[PDB]
C-alpha cells in the first residue's frame, strides 16, 4: 500500500476507549458524577417532572 | 533537518485527528494508534528513504486536511484575533501647521 | 474626576432648531 | 483589562472608555431635548393624523384625546 | 515581479515588521501587490475547481431525479 | 488580574502530575528539564504541548514548540502572551 | 470602571487655545452667514413655479366636472 | 403620535453617536434604550389601533420629490401590515439594546456601538412606514449602510471589513433589480404611491407586472438572503451578537419578505413571479439547512437556521398567502432572536469560544440557558402546540393544500429541510449541553473542590451565566415562543379573519387555498412533520452519547469524506463566486487600467505622437544645413513641383499622397 | 512646500509607485496586446451600439394596459 505503515481499516479499529493508557488520570475527571451519563440527563427536560404533577391534579 | 520537521507531521497529525472526530474520548485511542505508528520508525537513518517517507505522510495531511480546523479565539484564524487593537504609537502627534 | 461642557454645537443644534 | 490608547484623540461619540464626572445632568440636559421635540413632533403628527373610519365612542382608543381629526367630529356628532 | 502569491499562505506566526499584513519591511511587491494582500477576496482552497462543478452536479442530478 | 507566576505553576502541575510515564511525581520542580530530571523521550515532549495549548486555550507554533523543553520555559514563555485565559 | 473623555480638539493641548489663521471671521460671518441670512429670505420669496401655477388651473379645471367639488357654484 | 414612534429612535442615535462624549457610556445607553422603550410602547398602542379598530392613518410631512408626474413624498402610512411589522422589530430591538448593555461593557467604545442598533431601528421604522417604493428605499439602504457599519464594527478585524464589503456590497446588487423595478414601476404607472400602483395594478399589462415583479424579487433576495444573494449573510456574524439578533435574525433579513408581502396587490396578477417565490422558497430552504448541519460555529449555524426560516417564508409568498407568511414572520423572529441571545450567553461563559468541538457540560453551569434555547428550539422546529408550530408547520398544509404538482413537490423539499432542521438543532443542544465536556478545565473547574492552595481567591472563573440585564431579555422572550403563537392564531391565520380588510395583503379568490389547508389534506400529512421531529431526533440521541461510532466511520469513508467537506464549505459557492465574479472584476480592471489607460490609449494618442512627432521635425530640421547651395537645389526642386503640378492637370489627390509620402518617408530614418 | 510629518517610504513601495507611474512608456505593439485593445475599444462599444440600435423605440410602459404590449415596432 504505502511505504508508511498505514491502514484504514487498523486506523479505524482503535477508534475506542482504550484498555492501557497514560492519559486518564488527566482526563478522568470528566467521566466522574458531574459529567456521568446519567446526571448529565438528569436536567435534560427541567420542568417536565414537575409539570406533571400539577397536570394530573388538574385532571383530578 | 529531518528532525525538526518530523516533530512537526505528529505536531499536526493527532491534532488533525481531533478536528475531525468531536468525541476525543474516541480521539484519546486514536493517538496510540498515531504514537505507536511513529515508535515503528524508530532508528530510520538513510536520509534517501527517511525524506521520502516525510514527504509521502505530507501528502496523506492533505488528503485528510479538515474542512476547518479548530483555532483559539485570539489565533490567526480565531474569531476574537486583532479585535480591540491599541494604536501602535501612543505619543502624541508633534508640533505642525496643518 | 474632569467634566464635558456641554459645548457650543450643542447650543448650535438646539438653537438652530 | 483595559486596552491603552491615546490621550489627544478626540471623539464625538466619547472615545475609548469615555464618560464625563457630569454624565447624568448632561444626559437630563439631552432628555429634556428629546422630549420637547417629540412633543413638538407629537403636536404636529396629532394635527396631520389624516383618517377616514371613525371609531366606536365605546371601544378603548388613546388617540381620542390630542388628535383633531376627530376630537372635532366627536363633538360635532356630539349635536342633536 | 516576485512570484504572485497570496498573502493568505505567508505564515501568521512569523517575524513580520507589519504582522497585520505578514510583510516585511522592504519586502519585494507584486504589480498586484493591490489586490495580493490580507485584504483581498479570500482564495478558498478546500478542492481544485475542476472537481466542484461535477460534486455540486451531483446534487443538482439528485434534485432533478428527486423531482422527476 | 492576570495569569501569576503561583497561577501558572500548581496548575500546569496538575496536566503533567498524570503522566503514568514520568519517573515520579516528585521529581518535577521549577527547572525540571523535560528529559534529564523527568522520565520524557523526544517524542513525548511534543505531547506535553499538545496538552499544554489545549488546556491554556492557546496555540503554539512550530517554531516556538522547539525552545520550550523544560517546564522552567514553560513558566516564562506563557507569562510573555497575555492571549493565557 | 469608566476613563473620564479626553482629546484635543482641533489639536489644541489643554495649556494653549485655537490661534486663528484669518479664514474664520470671513467664513463664518460672511459665507456661512449669508447663506443663513439668505435662507431667511427664501421663506419669504414668493412662489413662482410651474407647480404652484398649474394646480390653481387644474383645480378649476376638474371642477367642471365630478372630481374636486368646487366650494362655490357658480 | 404616529410621526413621533419615526423620531425617538432617530434621536436617541444623535446624542449617542455624535454627543455621546457629553453623555457618556451610561447615558448613551439610558437614553437610547428609553428612546426604543417608549417607541416599542407606542408601536403596540398602534397595533390596537390601527389593525383591531381597523383604521388605517396617513402622514405626508412634505415633498422629497417633485419632477412632472413624479412627486414622492416624505409621508408614512399606518395600516395592517406596518404595525405587525413594527411589532418584531421594536420588542427584540429594546430587548438587544438591554442585551448590550450587559454584553459590551468591556467593549471601550460602547457608545457608538448603541448608537448603530438606534440607527438601525431608525430606519426599520422608515422602510414599512413608508407611503411609496422610493421612501422605502430609504430605509432599504439605511439598513444595509447601518449592517456593513455594525459588521464592521471592529475594524481592526480585517474578517470584519471583508464581510461587512461583502454585505454591502451583495445588497447592493439586489438595489440595481431594486431600483430598475423601481423605474419600470415609474415608466409604467407615473409614481410609486402604494395607493396608485395597487388600485391601477389589476389592469396593468400582465408583461409589466412580471418585469416589475422580477425585479422586485431579486431585490428581496438580498436582503432576505436566498439561494444565490446569501454569500453576505453567514460571516455578516463577524459583527457583535446583539447586532446579530436584532438585524441578522429577525429584522433587516426580513426586509425582502415584508417588500413581497407589501406588494402583494400587485404581484398577485402574475402568477410567474409566485411560481418563481414558491420554487425558489423550496431550494434556499433546503439549501441551507444542509449547511448548518456541518458547521463549527455556533453563530454560524443559528446564521443559516435564519436563510431557511427565511426561505419558508418567500415559500408561502408564491403560495399566494401571504397572511401565513406574515404570522410565521413574527413568530419566527421572537424564539430566533432568542437563540442568538442565548447563544450570546455562551459565548460570554466560555473566553468567547464559538467552536462546538470545544463545547460540553455546562448543564449545571448555565441552567437558564439550556432552558430557553431548548424552548425556542422547540418552537424553530415546529414542536407541537408552540409559538413556531402554527407559523412554521401551517406552511407544509398550506404546500400541499395547493393540490398541484408545484405544491406537493416542495412539500417533500420542504420536509426533507425540516429534517435536516431537526439534526442541527439538537446538535447545538448536544454539543453544547447533552454532551461530555470537550473544553479546557477553566471552563467547568468550580469552587466545590479546592484543587488550589495560594490561588483560591482567583482562577476559578468556571463558566458563570449572566446578570440581569443579560438574562431578563431571554426570560422575555421564552414567555413570547411558548404562548404568543397561539394567542394570535386567530388574528393572522384564523379562518375567515377581516384583520387585513383595508387592502394591506391582498389575496385572489382564483388561488385560495385556506379551506383546502384544512379539509382535503389528509390528516397523516398534518401530523407527518410531528412524526419525523419526534423519530429523527433520536437517532441523532442515539448516534452520539449512544453509539458515537457510526457518526465516526461515515465521516472517513471515501464517499462520506467529501459529503462532509461539500456541505461544510457552503456548496463551494463563495468558491464560485470568489473566483469567477469578484476576481474577474478584479482582473478585468487590471487589463483596462495596464493594457488600456496607461498603455495602448497613451501609444496610440499623446505619447505616441509625442515620439514619433518629435522624430518627424528632427528629420526636417536635418535638412536645415545652412549651405546656401542645398538651399538653391530646394528652391529649384519646388519651383519644378509647383510647375509640374499646374501645367500637367494633375489631380488633387497626388499632391496629398505626395506630401503623406514625403512626410513619411521624412519619419523614416536614414 | 510645508513639510509633513515622517514616514516610513518603503523602496518597495516607492518603486512600485514609479513603475505604475511611468508603465505608459513601455507599452508595445504585439499579437496579444492588439486583441485585448481592440476587444475592449472596438468590439464591446460596437456590440452595445449594435444591441442599442436595434432595439431603439422598441419597447414603451407607460400606460399599456391588459390587453396591449409593450412593444411598439
Ligand atoms: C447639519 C445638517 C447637515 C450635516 C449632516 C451630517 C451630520 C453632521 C454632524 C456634525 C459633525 C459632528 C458633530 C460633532 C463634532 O465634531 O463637534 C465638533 C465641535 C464640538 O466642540 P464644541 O466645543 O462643541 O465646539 C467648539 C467650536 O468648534 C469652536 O469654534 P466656534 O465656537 O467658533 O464655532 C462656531 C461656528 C460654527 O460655524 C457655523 O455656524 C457653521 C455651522 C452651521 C450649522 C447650520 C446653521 C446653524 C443654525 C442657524 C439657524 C437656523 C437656520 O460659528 C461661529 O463662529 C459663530 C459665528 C456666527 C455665525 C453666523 C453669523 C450670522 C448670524 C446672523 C444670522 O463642534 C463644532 O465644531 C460646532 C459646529 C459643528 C456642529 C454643528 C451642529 C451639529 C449637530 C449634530 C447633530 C445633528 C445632526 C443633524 C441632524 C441629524
Ligand atoms: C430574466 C428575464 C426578465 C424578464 C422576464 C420575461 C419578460 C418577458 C417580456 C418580453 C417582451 C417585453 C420587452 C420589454 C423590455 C423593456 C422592459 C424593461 C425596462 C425596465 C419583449 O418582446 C419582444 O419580443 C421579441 C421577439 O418576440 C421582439 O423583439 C424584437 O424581435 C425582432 C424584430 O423583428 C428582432 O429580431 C429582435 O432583435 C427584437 O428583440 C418583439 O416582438 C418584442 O419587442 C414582450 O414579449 C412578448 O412579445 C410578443 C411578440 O413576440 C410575444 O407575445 C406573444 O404573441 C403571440 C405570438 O405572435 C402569442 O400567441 C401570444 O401568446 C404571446 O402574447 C411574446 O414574445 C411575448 O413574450
Ligand atoms: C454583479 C457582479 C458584482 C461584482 C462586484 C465586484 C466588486 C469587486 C470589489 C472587490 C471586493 C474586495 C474584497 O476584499 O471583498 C471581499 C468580500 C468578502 O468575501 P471573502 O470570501 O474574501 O470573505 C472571507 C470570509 N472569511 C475571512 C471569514 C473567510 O467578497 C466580496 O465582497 C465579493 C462578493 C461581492 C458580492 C457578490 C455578488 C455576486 C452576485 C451573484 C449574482 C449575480
Ligand atoms: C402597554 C399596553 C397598554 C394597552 C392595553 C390595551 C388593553 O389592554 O385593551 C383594552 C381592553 C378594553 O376593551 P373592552 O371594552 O374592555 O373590551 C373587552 C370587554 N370584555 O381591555 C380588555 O379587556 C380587552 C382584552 C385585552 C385586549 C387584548 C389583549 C391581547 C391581544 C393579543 C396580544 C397582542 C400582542 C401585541
Ligand atoms: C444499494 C445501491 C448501491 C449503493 C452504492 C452504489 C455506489 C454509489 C452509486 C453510484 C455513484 C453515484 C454518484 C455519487 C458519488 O459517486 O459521489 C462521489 C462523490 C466523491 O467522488 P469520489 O470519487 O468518491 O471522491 C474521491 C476523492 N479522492 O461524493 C461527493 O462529492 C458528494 C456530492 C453529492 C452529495 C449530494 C448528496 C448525496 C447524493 C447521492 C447521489
Ligand atoms: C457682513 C457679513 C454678514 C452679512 C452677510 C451677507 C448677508 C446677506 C446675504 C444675502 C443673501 C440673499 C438674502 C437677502 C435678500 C436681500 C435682497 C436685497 O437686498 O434687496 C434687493 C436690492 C433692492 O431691490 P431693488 O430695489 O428692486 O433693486 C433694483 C436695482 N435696479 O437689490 C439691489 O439692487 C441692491 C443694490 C445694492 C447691492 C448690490
Ligand atoms: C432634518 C429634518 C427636517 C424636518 C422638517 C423641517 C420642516 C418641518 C415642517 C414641514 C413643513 O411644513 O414643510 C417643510 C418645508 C416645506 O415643504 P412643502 O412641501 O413645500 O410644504 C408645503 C406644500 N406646498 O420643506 C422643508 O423645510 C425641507 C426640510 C428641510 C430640508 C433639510
Ligand atoms: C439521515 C439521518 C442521518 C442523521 C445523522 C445526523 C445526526 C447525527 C449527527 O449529529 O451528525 C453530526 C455530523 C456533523 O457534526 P460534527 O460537527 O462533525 O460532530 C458530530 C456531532 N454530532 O454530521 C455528519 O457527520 C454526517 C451525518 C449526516 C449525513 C447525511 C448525508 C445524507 C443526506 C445528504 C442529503 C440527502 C438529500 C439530498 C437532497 C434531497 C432533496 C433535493
Ligand atoms: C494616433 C497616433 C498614434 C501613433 O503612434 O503615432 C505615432 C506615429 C509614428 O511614431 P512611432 O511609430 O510611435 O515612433 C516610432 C516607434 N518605433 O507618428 C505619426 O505618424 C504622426 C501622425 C500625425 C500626422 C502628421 C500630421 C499630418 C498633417 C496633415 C498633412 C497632410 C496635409
Ligand atoms: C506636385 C507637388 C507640388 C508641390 C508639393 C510638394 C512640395 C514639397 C517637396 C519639395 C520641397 C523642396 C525641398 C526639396 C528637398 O528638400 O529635397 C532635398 C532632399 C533632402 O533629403 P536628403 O537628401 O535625404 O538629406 C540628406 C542629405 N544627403 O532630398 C531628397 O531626397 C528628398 C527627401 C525628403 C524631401 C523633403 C522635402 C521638404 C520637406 C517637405
Ligand atoms: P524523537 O521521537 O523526537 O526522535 C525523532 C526521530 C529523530 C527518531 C525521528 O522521528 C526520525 O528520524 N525518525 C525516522 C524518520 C521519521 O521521521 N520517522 C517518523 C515517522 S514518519 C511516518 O511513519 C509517516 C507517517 C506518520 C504518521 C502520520 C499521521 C497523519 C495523520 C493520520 C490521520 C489523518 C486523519 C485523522
Known sequence: ?60 | ?98 | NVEEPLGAAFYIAVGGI | ?80 | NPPRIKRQFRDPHADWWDKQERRNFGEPVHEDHDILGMFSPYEYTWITPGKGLFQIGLFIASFLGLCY | ?85 | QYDPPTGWLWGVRPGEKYQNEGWEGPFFYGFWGSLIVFAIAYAYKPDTSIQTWALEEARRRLEAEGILEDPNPT | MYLSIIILPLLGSVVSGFFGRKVGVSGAQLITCSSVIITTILSIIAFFEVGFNNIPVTINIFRWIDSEWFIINWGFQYDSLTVSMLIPVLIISSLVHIYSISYMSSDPHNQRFFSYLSLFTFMMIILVTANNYLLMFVGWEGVGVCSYLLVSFWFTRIAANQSSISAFLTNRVGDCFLTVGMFAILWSLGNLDYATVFSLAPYINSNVVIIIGICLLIGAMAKSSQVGLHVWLPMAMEGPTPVSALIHAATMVTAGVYLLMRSSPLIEYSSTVLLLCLWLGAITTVFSSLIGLFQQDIKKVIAYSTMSQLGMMVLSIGLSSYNIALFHLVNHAFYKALLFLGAGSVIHAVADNQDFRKFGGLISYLPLTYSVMLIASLSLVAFPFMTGFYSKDFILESAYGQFSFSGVAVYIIATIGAIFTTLYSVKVLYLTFLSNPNGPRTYYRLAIDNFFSAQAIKSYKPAHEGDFFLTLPLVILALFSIFFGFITKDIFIGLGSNFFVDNSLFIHPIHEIMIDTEFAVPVLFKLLPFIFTISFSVIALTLSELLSELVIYFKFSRFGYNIFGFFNQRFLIEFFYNKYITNLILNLGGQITKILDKGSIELFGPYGLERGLVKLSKNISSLSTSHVTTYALYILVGFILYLIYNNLLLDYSYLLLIIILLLLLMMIGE | ?73
Open chain 4, 1 to 80: 483589562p483595559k486596552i491603552p490608547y491615546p490621550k489627544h484623540v478626540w471623539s464625538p461619540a466619547g472615545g475609548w472608555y469615555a464618560q464625563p464626572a457630569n454624565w447624568k445632568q448632561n444626559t437630563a440636559i439631552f432628555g429634556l431635548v428629546i422630549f420637547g421635540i417629540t412633543a413638538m413632533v407629537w403636536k404636529y403628527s396629532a394635527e396631520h393624523e389624516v383618517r377616514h373610519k371613525m371609531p366606536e365612542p365605546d371601544r378603548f382608543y388613546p388617540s381620542r384625546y390630542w388628535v383633531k381629526q376627530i376630537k372635532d367630529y366627536e363633538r360635532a356628532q356630539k349635536e342633536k
Open chain 6, 1 to 85: 488580574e492576570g495569569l501569576q507566576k503561583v497561577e501558572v505553576y500548581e496548575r500546569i502541575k496538575s496536566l503533567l502530575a498524570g503522566f503514568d510515564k514520568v519517573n515520579d511525581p516528585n521529581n518535577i520542580t521549577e527547572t525540571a528539564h523535560f528529559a534529564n530530571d523527568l522520565g520524557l523521550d523526544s517524542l513525548d515532549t511534543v505531547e506535553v504541548v499538545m496538552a499544554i495549548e489545549e488546556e491554556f486555550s492557546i496555540e503554539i507554533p512550530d517554531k516556538d514548540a522547539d525552545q520550550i523543553h523544560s517546564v522552567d520555559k514553560a513558566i516564562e514563555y506563557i507569562l510573555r502572551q497575555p492571549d493565557a485565559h
Open chain 1, 1 to 60: 500500500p504505502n511505504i508508511t505503515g498505514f491502514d484504514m481499516r487498523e486506523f479505524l479499529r482503535h477508534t475506542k476507549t482504550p484498555t492501557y493508557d497514560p492519559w486518564e488520570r488527566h482526563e478522568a475527571w470528566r467521566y466522574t458524577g458531574r459529567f456521568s451519563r446519567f446526571n448529565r440527563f438528569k436536567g435534560a427536560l427541567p420542568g417536565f417532572g414537575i409539570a406533571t404533577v400539577a397536570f394530573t391534579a388538574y385532571c383530578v
Open chain 9, 1 to 73: 512646500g510645508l513639510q509633513h510629518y515622517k514616514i516610513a517610504m518603503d523602496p518597495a513601495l516607492v518603486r512600485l509607485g514609479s513603475m505604475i507611474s511611468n508603465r505608459y512608456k513601455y507599452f508595445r505593439w504585439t499579437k496579444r496586446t492588439a486583441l485585448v485593445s481592440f476587444m475592449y475599444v472596438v468590439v464591446v462599444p460596437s456590440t452595445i451600439g449594435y444591441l442599442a440600435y436595434k432595439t431603439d423605440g422598441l419597447w414603451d410602459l407607460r400606460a399599456k394596459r391588459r390587453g396591449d404590449l409593450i412593444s411598439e415596432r
Open chain 2, 1 to 98: 533537518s529531518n528532525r525538526q520537521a518530523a516533530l512537526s507531521l505528529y505536531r499536526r497529525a493527532l491534532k488533525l485527528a481531533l478536528d475531525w472526530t468531536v468525541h476525543r474520548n474516541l480521539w484519546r485511542g486514536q493517538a496510540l494508534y498515531i504514537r505507536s505508528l511513529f515508535e515503528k520508525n524508530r532508528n530510520v537513518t538513510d536520509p534517501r528513504l527517511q525524506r521520502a517517507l516525510l514527504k509521502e505522510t505530507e501528502k496523506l495531511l492533505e488528503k485528510w486536511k479538515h474542512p476547518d480546523p479548530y483555532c483559539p479565539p485570539t489565533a490567526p484564524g480565531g474569531s476574537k484575533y486583532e479585535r480591540n487593537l491599541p494604536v501602535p504609537n501612543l505619543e502624541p502627534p508633534p508640533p505642525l501647521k496643518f
